[PDB]
């Protein structure tokens, strides 16, 4: 029933866990406790098979362990910084008037690790932007930002006032101080049926060919500029980008990362020169 | 079915692309590979006719290539600038207290080029205004702008405090700092059934007659003023006007512009004196 | 809540093997426990093995671990790792042991679980008073011990706070490790952990098993 489905959803009682059946001692030739893990299959033995038990009605649900639950949570994926200036000449430059970032999920460890539990993922996502601006002077003046999404192959701004910011076909979001945090959705977007978290392959056969998932990354870039002109009071602007997956599918589970990440789109785990060999969380006893 | 139409729209599956039928080698007198392009008609030969193929179910749609998709996107069409002043006498002048702009789509190359793929277009449009103000002093004080649309033949303001700003019959939009970006719709408006992107004709027979689409432009002008009086702290105000076409029809496809635009409402492509002959994107090999 | 790409049809979904619906499906996979956590073993494969030998004395201990799923050594297992993303947990656990001696080797072990509040057993005699399994090593190489959900509450914390500790697992010799001539007097045992049908996780949180500095 469609409504019962609604009610269960409201109560978080959709994925219902089995009850424990009562049992008594058994003397047999059957031996649920013995098996061969060599077969590659998890032993099927349950509490009911080994331990005399009382009947227990289970009110536990697995809804919070769903993929939609686990991955469908906002988290920071990037930081973008500006250092504006009253000097019109210095302004308009990258790093001062505008800043760009190549889109990936590999920059922030918490997210990266959660997604790289899977080999392939498919999802739509929400982008939420949190903006801060630290006045360095005695005022903030007027702050208006433009966040432009530039698909792969599209031109990327070189100057704050480039024609590229006209946003003819590129999606753009504007934000003014006092405005609620910007939010928009990016549909699953790829040329494959799923995103590759890992990719065991190359751009080509040559020595210079790229190897990791970087060869599949087709997420484009985000360009952000200060819309307003140079103002008397300089400010430091930091934008944080949060990401939330929706309508999530995932395939082929992987082990979690044991050692610290070193580089974007790489599995390299070896510490920098002079840095002690990477550690894991397994503690000596 | 009206609802199935809704569902297809939601899923972006309205304009569905044909499947590939299976085929085998054919030996015949028919020759799909041969034709006369001299006839002015595109060869009709399909993959199915020349290459043995397997059956493929197509899940591709053409919705994103629709005219409504292609042209129905916001983009900047204009910039309007003010340089306000605490000096009441200097204030009230054009360029200081107010600024006017004649409406066209020809100012920004990205939009101009997308629309001048067609000879005639018909659409309603949204105007969205993005305002920035760069304090030059230690404050912004209070900023209130008035954006007045003045139809052709209507009087145009000469002073910030002219009677024309009374907006008796002219549409006006007001904006205060902190207010969400202003937006309004302008219905298809013309004396013809479509806008002329190009016009092969003249105002008259005389040598002084205008030639290009400028003779058909009937979009009026936008006048913007600082509503508030002169304030102690000067500010530089920049307004950007974005345009989005809706309910779009278009006729008679044209080649895309190959060379840079030189002038508003003109096809002239020749560079300024001393400037190297215009280039195209065709690269030497 | 708009889309930035109107009229954008997604790339068609195809069948890919291995679809995951929930994380419990992962928790139900037997995963190795790094029992032998010594300074000489934590950097290599050997951490996952437990040494068995012919004994002189009787009823000696083989190994001992906590059964708090996000505590050491369990913290680094698949369940521990998934558990570290949740605050609360419940349901029974399954511990499996694989014997890797010779076909000719003979061995009987006692595997026992001790509820909290007493402390680690000091003798096989005490261990036998808890939940236990006597494992006959034979044609079948793997034995499983199920640790029942015995608790004063529906859920325990994943946090390794003694207050809610689930107690201990110990392993003792039942008889001895017995071999014929031409068979090594040594053997190794491999320990695994997996979830039972009633296992659940609740209240998601950031993992404490991974960090970032740069």
């Amino acid at each position: 029933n469609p409504v019962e489905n609604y009610i269960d959803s409201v109560l978080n009682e959709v994925l219902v866990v089995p009850n424990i059946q009562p049992s008594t001692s058994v003397s047999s030739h059957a031996a649920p406790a013995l098996d061969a893990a060599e077969t590659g299959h998890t032993s099927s033995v349950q509490p009911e098979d080994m331990i005399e038990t009382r009947y227990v009605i289970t009110d536990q649900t697995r809804d919070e362990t769903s993929i939609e639950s686990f991955l469908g949570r906002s988290g920071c994926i990037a930081m973008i910084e500006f250092n504006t200036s009253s000097d019109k000449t210095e302004h308009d430059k990258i790093g001062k008037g505008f800043k760009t970032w190549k889109v990936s999920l590999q920059e922030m460890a918490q997210i990266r690790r959660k997604y790289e539990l899977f080999t392939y993922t498919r999802f739509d996502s929400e982008i939420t932007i949190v903006t801060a601006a630290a006045a360095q002077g005695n005022d903030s003046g007027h702050i208006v930002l433009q966040f432009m999404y530039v698909p792969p192959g599209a031109p990327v701004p070189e100057k704050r006032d480039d024609y590229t910011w006209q946003s003819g076909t590129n999606a753009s979001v504007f934000w003014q101080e006092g405005q609620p945090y910007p939010r928009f959705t990016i549909p699953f977007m790829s040329i494959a049926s799923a995103y590759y978290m890992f990719y065991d392959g190359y751009d080509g056969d040559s020595a210079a060919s790229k190897y990791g998932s970087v060869v599949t990354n087709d997420m484009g870039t985000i360009c952000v500029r200060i819309v307003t002109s140079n103002q008397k009071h300089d400010s430091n602007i930091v934008c944080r980008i949060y990401h939330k997956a929706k309508h999530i599918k995932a395939w082929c589970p992987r082990p979690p990362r044991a050692v610290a990440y070193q580089h974007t789109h790489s599995t390299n785990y070896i510490p920098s020169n002079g840095e002690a060999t990477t550690q894991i969380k397994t503690r000596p006893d | 079915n009206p609802v199935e139409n809704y569902i297809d729209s939601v899923l972006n599956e309205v304009l569905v692309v044909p499947n590939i039928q299976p085929s085998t080698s054919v030996s015949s007198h028919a020759a799909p590979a041969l034709d006369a392009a001299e006839t002015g008609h595109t060869s009709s030969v399909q993959p199915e006719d020349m290459i043995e193929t397997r059956y493929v179910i197509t899940d591709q749609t053409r919705d994103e290539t629709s005219i409504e998709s292609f042209l129905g996107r916001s983009g900047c069409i204009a910039m309007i600038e003010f340089n306000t002043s605490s000096d009441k006498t200097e204030h009230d002048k054009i360029g200081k207290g107010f600024k006017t702009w004649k409406v066209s789509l020809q100012e920004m190359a990205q939009i101009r080029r997308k629309y001048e793929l067609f000879t005639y277009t018909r659409f309603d449009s949204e105007i969205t205004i993005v305002t920035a103000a760069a304090a030059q002093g230690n404050d912004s004080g209070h900023i209130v702008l008035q954006f007045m649309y003045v139809p052709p033949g209507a009087p145009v303001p000469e002073k910030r405090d002219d009677y024309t700003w009374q907006s008796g019959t002219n549409a006006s939009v007001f904006w205060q700092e902190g207010q969400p970006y202003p937006r309004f719709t302008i219905p298809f408006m013309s004396i013809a059934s479509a806008y002329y992107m190009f016009y092969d004709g003249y105002d008259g027979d005389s040598a002084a007659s205008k030639y290009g689409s400028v003779v058909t432009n009937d979009m009026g002008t936008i006048c913007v003023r600082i509503v508030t009086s002169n304030q102690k702290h000067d500010s530089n105000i920049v307004c950007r006007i974005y345009h989005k076409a809706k309910h779009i029809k278009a006729w008679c496809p044209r080649p895309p512009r190959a060379v840079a635009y030189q002038h508003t409402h003109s096809t002239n492509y020749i560079p300024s004196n001393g400037e190297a002959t215009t280039q195209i994107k065709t690269r030497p090999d | 809540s708009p889309s930035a790409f109107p009229y954008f049809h997604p790339t068609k979904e195809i069948f890919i093997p291995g679809q995951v619906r929930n994380l419990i499906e992962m928790c139900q996979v037997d995963t190795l426990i790094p029992v032998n956590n010594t300074q000489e073993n934590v950097r290599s494969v050997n951490m996952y093995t437990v040494d068995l030998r012919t004994q002189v004395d009787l009823a000696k201990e083989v190994f001992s671990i906590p059964v708090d799923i996000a505590s050491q050594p369990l913290a680094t297992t698949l369940i521990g790792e998934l558990a570290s993303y949740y605050t609360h947990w419940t349901g029974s656990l399954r511990f499996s042991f694989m014997f890797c001696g010779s076909a000719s080797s003979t061995l009987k072990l006692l595997i026992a679980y001790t509820p909290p509040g007493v402390g680690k057993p000091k003798s096989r005699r005490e261990a036998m008073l808890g939940t236990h399994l006597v494992w006959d090593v034979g044609l079948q190489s793997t034995a499983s011990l199920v640790v029942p959900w015995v608790s004063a509450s529906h859920f325990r914390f994943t946090t390794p706070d003694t207050y809610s500790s689930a107690g201990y697992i110990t392993c003792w010799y039942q008889t001895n490790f017995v071999v014929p001539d031409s068979t090594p007097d040594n053997a190794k045992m491999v320990c695994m952990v997996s979830a039972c049908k009633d296992f659940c996780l609740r209240l998601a949180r950031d993992t404490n098993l991974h960090t970032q500095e740069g």
Binding site: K246 | - | S3, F5, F8
Partner: peptide, 17 residues
């Protein structure tokens, strides 16, 4: 089950199954 936007991607979290 109200949808406010034309694009399916703009809908909220999926139901469980």
């Amino acid at each position: 089950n109200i949808n406010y936007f034309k694009d399916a991607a703009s809908s909220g979290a999926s139901r469980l199954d």
